[PDB]
């Protein structure tokens, strides 16, 4: 029994909400109805969850009943079916359990811990440092490079190799990724996911997700290319391989989720994901570093103390670096990359902050409202690294810190992300000092929304130390 | 008190449920609200019933309160009135009782048992085998032939004659039937229907008027000084008597509808199942082989099949039953309506609520069959290997409204099916991709187009 806008007939609230700037409308509504309001976009019932309490209660307290995902019809066009749901949007069930366990364990096994992947990231972090350096003096937009660098890490783990920063196929992938991402929000997608005006209306059904489809077919190419060379006798060296060997081990039953339709989706899930997240965060990192050179200096120091200005950073350093760690965690809290997170759905009736949400209710965990809950952080809306430091000056991670959400569905890439961030971030400041272009206006801290929110375009100066 | 979408004043939920692919939206909804949800398509209240329990409960347990049918306005266009509702869509009442009892009894007497119809089917089964064979080597689409063959059985029992596979009028009838069938679905149907407002059933009308023609010539060849030779005659003999009785359903307007109900029905169902049968046999030659053997054991490769053989044939019987379960031809069955308030799986359904028995969810209930979405003949076999029919096997639904053609269908299937595999071995065309097992939805769901090779044994 949560309050609500009470939408007009037919389209419901489909119109009362601005889908090109959702974060905004949801706050304007949490202002009228507050924390736990509800809207009915078309036939679909919804319940937006604001503030730490309402989020932790649904995702953790009643986690066993909110681990499902609401069905997303318009994904038929990408080849999603019961026989293949990948992970990201797979419904709570065994096909999802299987792929979730495969993902977490396989990545871990591919060296996601110490010595291996950790140095695969420093190898790649080098190639990035150089590309940066190769732009001596002249200011520029780092977004693109970071994106390539980070994507090369997820490529290593999934496709078995890295790509040259000049490779056209690589850059096409990156572009399609950023464009398919944008198609994850927007009025169009919403309306087709409500009114079946998409069945036999190619004009509509075609244009939507035109990039997501274009992105997936670029991968199928990479996969078939990749699968052609797969030699069973060699233990798997990348996710694709590990998956194919499972498709073999599970030749037995047609019930297994290890099959050709799933392979592209699971691989696409992880590839795309590790390709447009950390990267965006690293853009927020660098921006906030030129917008706050004072904090950049402090971190740049801690690096020289423990790590030194000559040897590459190692995960084992984070332990001895409380400031670099708090800055990074703050970059994430303030960066607030996935505002409304990822839609969940109730498996049975639940109660949150008093109201009672019925089964089949789409849940929208507004992680921004947690990442910046007024009743939690000292200075919520300002960049305050001391948010992760106690009196003695030792790093401390607060509960409200949920950039990866929580529950059975919590981001399964957190491990990779933590490592990527710390290694690329420090390796960058270790060998660099960034600042705003000498004669340019101070860059905006406002972010652009497209499901994921990145730092409004900006340039910076990269000079060596 | 069943869970379900928010009902908006507007035009109700009637605006957001894919009617060109309904089986899909109802499962995407049973995934959100589960097994017993409800929608309000316009003014009308509806309650979809998923899974064996909810179905058996409404149709069997509270059968006395769910045997009616919701009114379907759009059918005024076809000549449906209280004086004539046929059977299929007839509202629970005397008019329906009379027609239903006439139907099952009359058909039974027209030989629907043994020796007679049974060999009228073998006779036609032959004509079929031939047309197949006359396509030596060259692969082809069996859909059309099967349709004509099975249609000739329903024609025999109701129009008293069979049709040449080349007859124009016959072929016209078949086409209209498959086109009118398509009209029993869609968006514009739900709309005009849930909002009575105009050239809509152009093909169902077209179908019925082709029959009126056939009905007219029939009265002419009918010799009333002889025991009924077929259904239509039997109906006219009933009418004659009903002269001067305003309460009888045996009247001119009902004659065409009753006849059309049975004719079109036995013309687009069994046929579709037989297409499912042949498909799953080229997609599973391994099972085709085993049945083809049981055939040569009991029946032999030369004498025509007889119903009396099903008893001694556990495998062919289980394959056929599984072809039906998996075939899953009438997914959402036929809408029923509550006569009074009842309760299903806890919730309370009000009087006047249209019921949608999702027979697919029964035919493929996760809590009943071993391997629900795979072709598993062993689904009707115990340890010993003797055929056994499970409760959840409800392709004909259940209750006072259960398909009144089940007897004819059982026979048609067994005899056409076995006679086909007996004198044939089907396979996918030598150099073509493996056929899809996904079916196309249009009220009834048929096997996505496909070709097969028919070579003799
Ligand atoms: C700093 C970077 C990242 C952030 C902030 C982020 C955060 C999130 C969040 C908030 C969710 C939704 C959780 C929910 O449904 O409640 C999610 C989903 C998930 N993330 Fe990430 N993510 C990042 C990195 C990545 C990376 C690098 C990968 C890939 C290896 C990835 C893999 C996934 C997957 C597969 C899911 C779906 C999990 C499931 O449904 O079970 N993410 N992420
Ligand atoms: C492949 C074979 C067939 C299948 C799967 C099938 C199935 C069904 C189903 C599911 C119903 C609706 C039951 C309900 O009220 O809930 C129905 C009813 C009906 N069927 Fe069939 N059918 C088939 C064969 C036939 C044949 C061969 C005839 C023709 C004599 C026919 C005549 C009827 C009639 C007249 C009804 C309406 C019965 C009533 O309202 O009392 N069906 N059928
Ligand atoms: C495999 C697909 C191409 S299928 C079509 C849509 N996308 S996408 O590239 O637009 C995308 C990328 C990231 C995302 O959000 C995430 C994921 C992980 N961590 C944090 C945020 C959502 C959607 C891919 C997808 O489903 N990925 O999950
Ligand atoms: C008499 C009518 C011409 S009135 C207009 C529509 N049709 S039709 O040819 O399109 C048709 C055929 C089969 C069907 O479904 C069945 C029947 C029996 N068993 C399982 C499924 C539904 C609709 C005729 C009709 O109502 N027949 O019942
Ligand atoms: Ni006659």
UniProtKB/Swiss-Prot annotation, chain A:
Changing residue 264 to C: In allele CYP2D6*2, allele CYP2D6*12, allele CYP2D6*14, allele CYP2D6*17, allele CYP2D6*45A, allele CYP2D6*45B and allele CYP2D6*46; significantly reduced monooxygenase activity toward anandamide; slight decrease of monooxygenase activity towards bufuralol. Keywords: Cholesterol metabolism, Endoplasmic reticulum, Fatty acid metabolism, Heme, Iron, Lipid metabolism, Membrane, Metal-binding, Microsome, Monooxygenase, Oxidoreductase, Steroid metabolism, Sterol metabolism. Coiled coil: none annotated. Its EC number is 1.14.14.-. Changing residue 265 to L: In allele CYP2D6*24. Changing residue 408 to C: >90% decrease of monooxygenase activity towards dextromethorphan and bufuralol. GO terms for molecular function: anandamide 11,12 epoxidase activity; anandamide 14,15 epoxidase activity; anandamide 8,9 epoxidase activity; heme binding; iron ion binding; monooxygenase activity; oxidoreductase activity; oxidoreductase activity, acting on paired donors, with incorporation or reduction of molecular oxygen, reduced flavin or flavoprotein as one donor, and incorporation of one atom of oxygen. Changing residue 110 to S: In allele CYP2D6*89; >90% decrease of monooxygenase activity towards dextromethorphan and bufuralol. Belongs to the cytochrome P450 family. This is Cytochrome P450 2D6.
UniProtKB/Swiss-Prot annotation, chain B:
Changing residue 257 to L: In allele CYP2D6*24. It is an enzyme of class 1 (oxidoreductase). Keywords: Cholesterol metabolism, Endoplasmic reticulum, Fatty acid metabolism, Heme, Iron, Lipid metabolism, Membrane, Metal-binding, Microsome, Monooxygenase, Oxidoreductase, Steroid metabolism, Sterol metabolism. Its cofactor is heme. The keyword rRNA-binding does not apply. GO terms for cellular component: cytoplasm; endoplasmic reticulum; endoplasmic reticulum membrane; intracellular membrane-bounded organelle; mitochondrion. Coiled coil: none annotated. InterPro entries: Cyt_P450, Cyt_P450_CS, Cyt_P450_E_grp-I, Cyt_P450_E_grp-I_CYP2D-like, Cyt_P450_sf, Cytochrome_P450_fam2. Belongs to the cytochrome P450 family. This is Cytochrome P450 2D6. The gene is CYP2D6.
